[PDB]
Design a protein around this ligand. Structure first.
Ligand code: NA
Lengths: 306, 306
């Protein structure tokens, strides 16, 4: 037993990380088959970043202006193209370590692992959630751009995130692997409003199920509620509305614990209205929302990869 | 910017994980060169765990009683030997993915990453601390036994932990890679008391420095303390005594932030006495003690591995 924030094993992603240099800018690229994927702002200086015309900046670059290094192997660039906010650098060599993969665009509230990288080399792996406002609360320094987020299902790597920027607020924004930003963000060093963020209600509930399974039960109460009643409370506390689809997703955890979702909603409601009275749940003095129902089932059943 | 509980990239360790089955018992092993290392209780049934004579039990076992799977391939056991609480299974094939490695015995309060595994298959990676009482608060399901803990220094994997036991109280006990238990624990399914745990003071200070570097400064004050007077208060809240060795270890973080160690101790003193009063530090409602000073420096300056 025990319950931890767990990242996917990073080995299949480590084998794909490369360094991309264009003029004086170096960041990270992802090498799958004979294509290297990286943030288009590799072609920008910090001056260009205030108001970049990517089309005109890219027209100045040839294949040989892109230095791509995989460990010590120099790759040769034989094509370049811009797709939305990503550059695709065609190289003359297939990555022999290419895992089975998919490109996926994740929904807000979904979790993924980030392999944080500098100069094409891995520094660390951590789990996070795509906030309802399509930001992530990461650990990204100067040079981390091109670091990717992913899920692993047995042998298949689903790439869902590439890192592009830090907002002035110190939260993180980036794209899917087709180069489309999550949220309204743009690859320009400018003031950018993220949404009002909200708590991922179905994730908090999943983690209350996790707590019961590990023997934390103090917050279980003799109340029930309705969806519409619970949702009036969720709106007051800036929690995402709960839908029947969310109830259906929680059903296996309901079945295990013998606690009907609406009874667990009545418990969450009392926690929102009364606070936690300085008590903890799974070693947290806050309600955690960065575990999906699928993450709680995975960690509580013992699913594996390779 | 941003600060996350970051694990080491796990690729080097993934290539070393195998499955070891002896009769009804399956757990994880570590394949380095032509040796597979695993918990010696792989030779025990649940029935045997009550009072095993390992010497006698190991005598009844033949090489071919040890089923070793490295993915789709079965390794041939040609040797079995006991070192303290680890079995070394000699195999006919050296691991071609053997990284540069050391075995190291770590100190209470030091941190490491765990590659959690089931039936030889890596399932996830997390960073934890060796508690002052030599337990780890992990996430370990039936058969996660044999999962290892490690650090990386440049190119060399330093293995420091193998998981052996889930204590009845729900924390975890295990050995160095020479099979010596951390703390007073034994590989017997028995009631075992863990010592009184304490909070890792030098780690909480390191994490307060990480907070300031990331723009969380509300807990700073213009109060002073001697090491001796801080320790009188730490003693009251079950915090480890802070030594000069500890103050010296925090010096680089003092130097970067311009906040004297004893000034940060004056801050922590205030935090223990008045609590956090509804406020958070780096997103946490509690004081975090699973970051070392070294962990904060390498996260905050973007150290990488190859
Ligand atoms: Na721990």
């Amino acid at each position: 037993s025990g319950f931890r924030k767990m990242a996917f094993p990073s080995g299949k992603v480590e084998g794909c990380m490369v360094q991309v240099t264009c003029g004086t800018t170096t960041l990270n690229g992802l090498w799958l088959d004979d294509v290297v994927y990286c943030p288009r702002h590799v072609i920008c200086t910090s001056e260009d970043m205030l108001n970049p015309n990517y089309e005109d900046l890219l027209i100045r670059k040839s294949n040989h202006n892109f230095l791509v290094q995989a460990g010590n192997v120099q790759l040769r660039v034989i094509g370049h193209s811009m797709q939305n906010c990503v550059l695709k650098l065609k190289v003359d060599t297939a990555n022999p370590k290419t895992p089975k993969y998919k490109f996926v665009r994740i929904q807000p509230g979904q979790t993924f692992s980030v392999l944080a990288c500098y100069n094409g080399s891995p520094s660390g792996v951590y789990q996070c959630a795509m906030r309802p406002n399509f930001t992530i609360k990461g650990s990204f320094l100067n040079g981390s751009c091109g670091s990717v987020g992913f899920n692993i299902d047995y042998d298949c790597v689903s790439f869902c995130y590439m890192h592009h920027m830090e907002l002035p607020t110190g939260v993180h924004a980036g794209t899917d692997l087709e180069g489309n930003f999550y949220g309204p963000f743009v690859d320009r060093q400018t003031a950018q409003a993220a949404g009002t963020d909200t708590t991922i209600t179905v994730n908090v509930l999943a983690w209350l199920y996790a707590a019961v399974i590990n023997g934390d039960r103090w917050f279980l109460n003799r109340f029930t509620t309705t969806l519409n009643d619970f949702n009036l409370v969720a709106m007051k506390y800036n929690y995402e509305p709960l839908t029947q689809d969310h109830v259906d997703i929680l059903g296996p955890l309901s079945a295990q614990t013998g606690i009907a979702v609406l009874d667990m909603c009545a418990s969450l409601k009392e926690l929102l209205q009364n606070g936690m009275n300085g008590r903890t749940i799974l070693g947290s003095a806050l309600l955690e929302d960065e575990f999906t129902p699928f993450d709680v089932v995975r960690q509580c059943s013992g699913v594996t990869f390779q």
